[PDB]
Amino acid sequence: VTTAHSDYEIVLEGGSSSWGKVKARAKVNAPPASPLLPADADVKLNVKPLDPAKGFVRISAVFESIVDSTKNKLTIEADIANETKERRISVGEGMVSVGDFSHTFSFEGSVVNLFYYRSDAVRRNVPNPIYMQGRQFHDILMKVPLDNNDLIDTWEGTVKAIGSTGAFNDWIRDFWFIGPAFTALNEGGQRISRIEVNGLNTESGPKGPVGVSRWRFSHGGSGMVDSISRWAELFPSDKLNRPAQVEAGFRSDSQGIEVKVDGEFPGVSVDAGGGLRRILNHPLIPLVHHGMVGKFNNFNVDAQLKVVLPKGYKIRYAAPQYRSQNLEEYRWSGGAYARWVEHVAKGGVGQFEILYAQ
Amino acid sequence: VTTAHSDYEIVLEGGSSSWGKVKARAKVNAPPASPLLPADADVKLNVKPLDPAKGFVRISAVFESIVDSTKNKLTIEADIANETKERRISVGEGMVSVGDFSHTFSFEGSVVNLFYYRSDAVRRNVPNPIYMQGRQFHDILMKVPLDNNDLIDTWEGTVKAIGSTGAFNDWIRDFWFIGPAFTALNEGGQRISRIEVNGLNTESGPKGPVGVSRWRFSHGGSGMVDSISRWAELFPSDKLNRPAQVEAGFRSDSQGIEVKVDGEFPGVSVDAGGGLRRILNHPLIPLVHHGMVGKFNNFNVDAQLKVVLPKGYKIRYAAPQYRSQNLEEYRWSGGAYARWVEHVAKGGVGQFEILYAQ
Amino acid sequence: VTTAHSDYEIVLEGGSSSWGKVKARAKVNAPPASPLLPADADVKLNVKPLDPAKGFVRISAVFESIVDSTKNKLTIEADIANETKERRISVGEGMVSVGDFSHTFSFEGSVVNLFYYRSDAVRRNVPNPIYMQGRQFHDILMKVPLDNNDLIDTWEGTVKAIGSTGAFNDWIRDFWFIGPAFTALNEGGQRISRIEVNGLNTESGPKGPVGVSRWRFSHGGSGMVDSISRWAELFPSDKLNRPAQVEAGFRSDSQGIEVKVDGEFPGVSVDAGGGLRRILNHPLIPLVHHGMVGKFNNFNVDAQLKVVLPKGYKIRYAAPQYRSQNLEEYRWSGGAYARWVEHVAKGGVGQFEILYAQ
Ligand code: BCL
Ligand code: BCL
């Protein structure tokens, strides 16, 4: 018998605060859909206020994994700020390593997020809008020291390809969205444009030649792509009054999958209007993308959610309904909640709303 | 335990008549995949002979819904006629309303449906062909009175966009196929071309300015798109000797879905050749599209179908086989029928054929 | 209760040999997702060494089916050889028949398979790479005697279309990937280019006019398309020291599906390095494509695998683990193996690795 066991905990700050602590654990005795096993990964994300006056934060990410004995790592650290409601700017650096190979990089880039329409007729009549169609434009300048022969080979190969292959800006997407990543684009109503290569040259860096590229692309979303529809919400820099962090990891092999998440960050709750608040709307891409793997083994659900509201707050509406309550702490399990967990784990996006207030 | 309960009833006219009464009810205690709940809708479609000499019918549609408290409505009424086997013409009017906002519209449009091949070698050798690849071309002239400020804003915004944005005819499809509608295109082997904007201007209508647009698009189908493969069959104007109608609705929320259908129309049965008739072949798009939502909760099937043949007719072949019979009335439930209901509810298109005769 | 019963047997040659005998049987009491039933098919593939000095083999394929009473057949026989590691050449002939219609054909064609990158940094650090992004270019010259009126009609229709329709090279793909074949492309991360028509003319053949076309297309793969990622491996001509063959067939209708496979060919095992061997990595397209039909009825798994190693060899690693062993013969059933069978039958590609050695 295949059984998914999971526990989730949300502990909320009150007042005007959107912050929450989020913890999760899950295990299921079914294999992942990776054609290489075992596959283990640990991820740590950190972000701190940097310059509140200019709205800059400093964010870092560390990814480490082991896949069929191969050890991988990627880190990236960047300073990011909104310039306007639509244009965001970044500058950063990082590295990637795989077994005995590694390389570094630095970059700067701007992203401009544009909705296809704006209408007060929609805004005033839909209290909790979900879909927002739009397109996001990246402009990136990246640099990689060419300080081993593999880097040199790839740089020269790519220079040669760009020079000789008229369809490079098109076919590069076949390379980029490796394996089933390609398939996931259409699944989420996401489109990636042909790229533009605006600049390609070698620089004389302090330790040697540096490969420098300037390039652009856009990606379109029909409304489910959270990176576009919830662009401002997903970067709550104006709510980051202290450092935030999240650590997560999984272990997986032919026998099953185990996962753990432990984080604290702003944006967990939202002003719902009318003096109510809600847990933020569930982003759609995680459910749709995970939906591509959640349907391969039947499973029973053994799931519990615990939500701790701030002192003095009460739930006004929850659907699925909670099972029990002890002051500010509410618990869901079994019944309609278990059924909703099955639904979203298989790719469904049916709404689970929690509205609360003092 | 998740259980889908459903009942279907088909009552057929005899002789040369293709007409039937179709009733259905279903309920299932699982949530819909809507990221806004509750979601309730009622739909009424009507069509009557208008000018049998020119083949015009007058069709009307009313859609009403409530989604997370927002009240929606759209109506459309049109006169439609075949000009040729491939070209159909229409003229009509309607309105849309959402909360405190509303607008009207009128239009005329032609649609030309073209198959990619015609071959007697296929026709004479395949007795019940299903797939037909082809492409359908729309040419539309629509008008909307710009009689509130939101209409004015959207009209001017769109005029501005068409003027400034070279990729408008491309990216408009991201806006148009909102949310998971985008994803459904590829699922059904359906392609939407870039649009052509042939005309855009303001008219001085009786009550004020009117926004007028003339535009075109084609959509391609690899064979499953019923709008293309069964183009003539889906508009049985030559069989409409009296008014036809269908009413349907659903209620849904975090706890489940309930639905009801009650209609009467031509085209329910078909001449199968050899003096046999069949219930029409199941259209594929409904099953494929619904397949995108039917896989998120395991369910047991409690389904019954009742088919009442005209007096004196008998079933010659049915697969899945029926369970019971009382004169002209045949009933299916359990066993292989329940298994077929599960199959098609999850997106399968395995054939369930009923052939009958006197 | 829906139950899938299946048995698989692999019997391996030893030494440096990659050959194996592969047998399979499966049955399941659920309907196929074919909108025409019954659907029965038998396939026979044969290949023999032809000219070991030039690397030519002679391969033949016979497909026969019956679909809703219509009898179909297609045969193809060809000589195929690698010219280089990337370029393969072929010349051959065949026929197609459907009911009272038939036609023949002959052809020659080259295919060039190109990976998007080559990197020693990947090669030396990933011991068993799976994804390889790339693009494959076909150049085909085919001839069909126009020796009945239907052939003449289609030839003239196509000549007319190519002449009049600017989007022919684009829309031809709607015709080509009939029905759900269209949808399967994106599912497997596969792209088909617009075609190029380089030549179209009529020849005066011995018995009459012959329609001759010269045309090209490429197809891209993001890494799962085995035709691209495992290009050399899939044509083990250098391992074909004697004839190989496989016969397979299925019978299906509204009640269920039964299938049988019986074959012997090189390429069943692979040198894994370190003096180990493995069963070849599971190709991804079969699992992904079948995944599009494997999710419509819940089923229980009654599956057994038997692997017979060459004398004196032992399994070093298997995950899922085997259940029993008798000398060189190992058996899997139930437990984690049954769970893996469910997973891959529904479209999962989680790795099942068997490594063995003396
Ligand atoms: C990922 C989905 C979208 C996308 C959506 C966005 C969004 C949204 C943003 C960017 C931004 C950036 N993108 Mg982009 N971007 C995509 C694909 C790309 C690709 C590529 C080759 O595929 C590249 C090179 C880039 C490059 C870049 C940079 C120019 C820029 C800064 C990145 C950074 O510092 O990351 C650092 C990396 C990480 C922090 C790793 C973790 C990333 C995941 C997604 C974050 C999960 C947050 C978690 C749920 C809660 C975190 C709480 C913690 C306490 C922080 N994008 C795809 C198409 N991109 C930012 C920008 O505008 O800069 C100007 C920005 O806000
Ligand atoms: C470059 C990337 C972008 C960015 C892209 C996104 C995207 C895209 C999304 C978010 C979302 C969220 N982000 Mg943000 N985000 C950025 C910076 C920040 C900052 C900040 C001050 O810098 C903060 C505090 C946040 C905070 C938040 C939350 C409001 C929200 C997640 C809520 C939740 O409950 O998660 C619960 C958390 C978990 C269940 C697990 C989180 C742990 C794992 C490790 C996080 C990463 C998972 C992902 C698969 C990894 C992909 C990595 C790439 C391949 C490189 N982001 C940068 C600028 N963020 C999500 C959301 O809901 O938006 C509305 C969302 O979809």
Ligand code: BCL
């Ligand atoms: C919907 C799937 C296909 C499509 C397939 C068809 C087909 C097929 C036809 C049209 C026709 C029309 N289409 Mg078109 N069309 C599509 C997308 C569009 C879009 C758009 C922005 O997406 C627009 C503006 C149009 C516009 C139009 C008009 C020019 C024209 C008349 C519409 C009408 O009166 O509807 C009135 C609206 C309704 C009746 C609502 C109900 C619609 C559903 C689909 C009908 C279900 C029938 C039910 C199962 C049985 C009904 C029995 C009742 C007793 C009647 N189409 C997509 C791509 N279109 C018609 C034509 O050729 O006119 C010249 C026609 O026959």
Ligand code: BCL
């Ligand atoms: C503008 C739209 C087009 C059109 C488009 C289609 C399409 C597309 C299809 C049909 C199909 C059918 N149509 Mg027609 N149809 C038109 C006009 C008509 C007229 C007429 C004389 O005007 C008649 C009598 C019919 C009759 C019929 C039947 C032969 C057949 C449904 C059989 C059945 O058992 O349904 C059983 C009915 C039900 C199970 C439920 C019906 C109730 C619901 C409310 C109907 C609409 C559902 C749909 C999801 C709503 C989408 C609305 C849009 C978003 C606006 N149509 C107009 C001209 N029609 C279907 C078929 O099988 O074709 C071969 C089909 O796929």
Ligand code: BCL
């Ligand atoms: C099928 C998936 C890919 C593809 C991948 C490949 C690969 C890979 C190769 C070709 C090759 C060829 N392709 Mg191609 N090809 C595709 C689509 C096409 C289409 C089309 C209209 O769709 C056409 C006309 C062609 C035409 C051709 C010829 C030019 C050439 C020889 C074919 C042959 O003899 O087949 C004979 C037909 C059969 C043997 C039928 C069986 C085919 C199945 C796929 C084989 C299963 C093997 C089985 C698992 C184990 C067999 C063991 C037996 C003992 C042999 N391809 C799609 C896009 N094509 C070959 C080449 O390069 O020639 C120069 C080659 O190696």
Ligand code: BCL
């Ligand atoms: C024109 C077609 C190409 C070609 C295309 C492919 C493709 C594509 C693939 C293979 C794969 C394999 N091929 Mg090869 N292959 C060709 C010629 C050969 C020759 C030869 C010396 O000529 C040999 C010995 C082989 C041998 C092999 C094996 C190494 C491997 C299957 C292993 C296994 O366990 O299958 C177990 C076998 C079965 C489970 C059942 C096989 C029985 C059925 C009848 C085979 C065909 C099924 C398929 C759905 C039919 C599609 C037909 C088309 C619509 C026309 N191929 C020709 C040149 N071959 C597969 C692989 O794993 O590659 C890494 C794979 O994906």
